[PDB]
Amino acid sequence: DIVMTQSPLSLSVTPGEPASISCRSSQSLLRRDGHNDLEWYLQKPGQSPQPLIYLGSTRASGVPDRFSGSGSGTDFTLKIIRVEAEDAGTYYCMQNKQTPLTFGQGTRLEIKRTVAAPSVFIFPPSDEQLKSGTASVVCLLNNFYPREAKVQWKVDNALQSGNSQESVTEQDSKDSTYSLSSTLTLSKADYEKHKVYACEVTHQGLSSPVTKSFNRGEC
């Protein structure tokens, strides 16, 4: 099976700057007609892959003039002249020389926008959930850049090393920001034995950590 290896595996490029992605195949993809059996796909967050380049250099239908493909045989390059917010996603090279069709590992392109601190929101357990004997505290972080954010849960000011789970959205295609949801899940018994519930957020765009908190039942 033809092996496709992409390089680098991730990029963080400032808008307006160029970017390039390397693709090396284990076998030649050079055809008898001269062209190369190499394709490039972009997979934007939440979408299915979309063609960019085919036959080594042919820019697909509606693909901006800013995307270019070059190279021959076993070495190829996707170039983006000036990176934009909408270029965020994972790029894949694909060989269509022989079956199995093989793809590269994928290179994630992050758009390196200006620092943006998150808006933090804390949500206490609803009485509906408390009835069932479980208590979840929700801490939401909105529209921040860079992705590095640290969320620390404090119960009566004592730090938690467990009981929490989080998820981060993929980079927004329009504003280049991330959003995060952190959930602290306690038992009702534990929740009823403590009073102060807080999530402390440390991010580059903040002067010092932001704490959002509430007192149980004082809502």
Binding site: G106, P125, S126, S136, Q165, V168
Partner: protein
């Protein structure tokens, strides 16, 4: 354009038949490939069926030890992927990809296949309100979507939309123990569209279980 269906939760050793229906163009003039993606990974070619002109010749990835069958219904304008003796590692988003006759290099929207012996678990959906003061002129409300299986498909929609309305959905994350997943959905809307006394609804569609409509009061 390219509508996919047939996906679902199946027990290991089970069977599934995936459909790739072209809507508003012929499929017979093109070759149909099937490509998969396990959540958080790259692309893996599954197989292809050649055009009626190339006598519907089939080719499959050797790793899928004769467990797949790619066929086509030229009268129904649909291509299929029948998968048998399903393995846990067959869990992925499956895409059909068109080759040759235009729409060339186009991918379907994908259909999800989850292979697990774990039983489906409906989410525990709860309204979330801020304990604090609201941001000036905006209302921030959320819904906790807790302890569900499979992780996808899961969709959350709100009873308010439009100008100044932003819904934020987060990827599910695995719970501390067991096979369950949790996420939340946040709604930001003008205070005017969420006046005191009014309530709003978050509609949670999970896998094949009946949808849940949860009431969230305006502040």
């Amino acid at each position: 354009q390219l509508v996919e269906s047939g996906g679902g939760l199946v027990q290991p050793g089970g069977s599934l038949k995936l459909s790739c229906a072209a809507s508003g163009f012929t499929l017979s003039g093109s070759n149909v490939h099937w490509v998969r993606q396990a959540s958080g990974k790259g692309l893996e070619w599954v197989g292809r069926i050649k055009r009626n002109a190339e006598s519907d010749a089939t080719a499959y990835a050797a790793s899928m030890r004769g467990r797949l069958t790619i066929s086509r219904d030229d009268s129904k304008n649909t291509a299929f992927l029948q998968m048998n003796s399903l393995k846990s590692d067959d869990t992925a988003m499956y895409y059909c990809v068109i080759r040759g006759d235009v729409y060339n290099r186009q991918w379907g929207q994908g259909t999800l296949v989850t292979v697990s012996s774990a039983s489906p678990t409906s989410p525990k959906v709860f309204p979330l309100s801020l304990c604090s003061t609201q941001p000036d002129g905006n209302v921030v409300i959320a819904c906790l979507v807790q302890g569900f299986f499979p992780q996808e498909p899961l969709s959350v929609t709100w009873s308010e939309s439009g100008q100044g309305v932003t819904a934020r959905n987060f990827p599910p994350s695995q719970d501390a123990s067991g096979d369950l997943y949790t996420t939340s959905s946040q709604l930001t809307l003008p205070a005017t569209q969420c006046l005191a006394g009014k309530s709003v609804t978050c509609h949670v569609k999970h896998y094949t279980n009946p949808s849940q409509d949860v009431t969230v009061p305006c502040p």
